[PDB]
Amino acid sequence: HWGYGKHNGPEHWHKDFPIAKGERQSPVDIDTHTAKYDPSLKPLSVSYDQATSLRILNNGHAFNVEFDDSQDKAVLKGGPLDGTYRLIQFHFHWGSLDGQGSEHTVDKKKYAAELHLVHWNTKYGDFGKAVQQPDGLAVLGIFLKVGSAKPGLQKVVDVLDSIKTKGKSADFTNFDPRGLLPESLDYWTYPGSLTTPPLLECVTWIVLKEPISVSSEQVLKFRKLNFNGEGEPEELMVDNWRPAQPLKNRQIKASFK
Numbered sequence: 001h002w003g004y005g006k007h008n009g010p011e012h013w014h015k016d017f018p019i020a021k022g023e024r025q026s027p028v029d030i031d032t033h034t035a036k037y038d039p040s041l042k043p044l045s046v047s048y049d050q051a052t053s054l055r056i057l058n059n060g061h062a063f064n065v066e067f068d069d070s071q072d073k074a075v076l077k078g079g080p081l082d083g084t085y086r087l088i089q090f091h092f093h094w095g096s097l098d099g100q101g102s103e104h105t106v107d108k109k110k111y112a113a114e115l116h117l118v119h120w121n122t123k124y125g126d127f128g129k130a131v132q133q134p135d136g137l138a139v140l141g142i143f144l145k146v147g148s149a150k151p152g153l154q155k156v157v158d159v160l161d162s163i164k165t166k167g168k169s170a171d172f173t174n175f176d177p178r179g180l181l182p183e184s185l186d187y188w189t190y191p192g193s194l195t196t197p198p199l200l201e202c203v204t205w206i207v208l209k210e211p212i213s214v215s216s217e218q219v220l221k222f223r224k225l226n227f228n229g230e231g232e233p234e235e236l237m238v239d240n241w242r243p244a245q246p247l248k249n250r251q252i253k254a255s256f257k
């Protein structure tokens with residue numbers, strides 16, 4: 001099975017998923033001096049007031065905080081997006097050390113972790129159909145740096161003990177994702193893909209420039225999770241990030257000047 005190790009990591013993914021060497025793969029390095037302000041970009045709208053979280057799951061490569069997307073309760077619109085995208089789940093990518101962990105990089109700088117809020121275009125009916133379209137998904141990427149603790153993240157941190165191993169899940173209702181957002185919504189955007197197999201190229205990426213700060217204690221809890229299942233030797237869940245991929249024929253646009 002694919003993973004992040006020496007024998008099953010990102011450099012091996014192309015064998016089972018040829019698109020790994022595709023034309024619009026993610027993540028990418030965001031060269032701030034090459035990105036251009038785009039006046040055509042509309043205001044970004046993040047409406048998470050009615051968000052309904054339901055469960056948190058350790059899927060063997062990260063943990064997903066799942067939401068009820070049977071209706072428009074938590075949606076992302078505006079910006080480079082046409083239409084409405086519904087929040088289905090969010091997860092993170094982090095490192096074994098604070099100096100690495102993010103997937104996207106800014107002028108080659110790696111952050112301690114990166115949050116991905118995944119949304120699907122409602123015009124396609126369901127997530128499965130959306131990932132078969134070039135404009136099927138919109139992922140809001142948020143960088144995490146180590147410093148002061150993030151109050152809105154503690155609820156996630158404290159429940160990780162109950163889903164330490166692969167396959168474990170726990171009820172996780174009433175979690176407000178608004179507490180994970182930085183102050184500013186300034187962002188960079190480009191067309192890309194899922195960063196984990198099947199690496200489908202159906203994502204409009206919206207990466208916020210302002211990182212949120214989390215405490216060393218909070219990130220350390222992330223690093224206590226396991227890639228392995230219960231009853232198997234312990235493999236700490238760390239460095240579950242894919243490196244930057246070639247930008248190729250793409251242009252990264254900035255929402256700010």
Ligand SMILES: N[C@H](Cc1ccccc1)C(=O)O
Nearest residue numbers: 059064194195196197198199
């Ligand atoms: N990256 C998908 C795993 C995944 C699917 C759906 C939700 C979250 C994660 C895969 O491993 O096949």
Ligand SMILES: [Hg+2]
Nearest residue numbers: 133134201202
């Ligand atoms: Hg696609």
Ligand SMILES: [Zn+2]
Nearest residue numbers: 091093116195
């Ligand atoms: Zn991700």
